[PDB]
Ligand binder design. Structure first.
Ligand SMILES: *[C@@H]1O[C@H](CO)[C@@H](O)[C@H](O)[C@H]1NC(C)=O
Lengths: 48, 48
């Protein structure tokens, strides 16, 4: 029941263990050197 | 610690002691992959 503004979709492939690192405020090789998320992040994370 | 050949049983845990070191953990990135890592009392981005 909402209308969204400035919608972007980012996509990649990781291993199963490192899925938990795609979240605000994390550390690890993926969060450090590959992909980082803001502290004030509004959005959603999907993985399968 | 991590690479030790034999680990203890849960009823008799090791309880090792550490001191006089620098705690640089990125040296683990290449060798090991953790499925669980959670911290209490501190944020994982301040650990360095
Ligand atoms: C990372 O780990 C793999 C696993 O054996 C190893 O072959 C590779 O040499 C390591 N990376 C470096 C830079 O040594």
């Amino acid at each position: 029941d909402l209308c969204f503004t400035n919608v972007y979709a980012d996509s990649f492939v990781v291993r199963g263990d490192e899925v938990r690192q795609i979240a605000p405020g994390q550390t690890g090789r993926i969060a450090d050197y590959n992909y980082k998320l803001p502290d004030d992040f509004t959005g959603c994370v999907i993985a399968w | 610690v991590f690479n030790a050949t034999t680990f203890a049983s849960v009823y008799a845990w090791n309880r090792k002691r550490i001191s006089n070191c620098v705690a640089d953990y990125s040296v683990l990135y290449n060798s090991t992959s953790f499925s669980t890592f959670k911290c209490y009392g501190v944020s994982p981005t301040k650990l360095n």
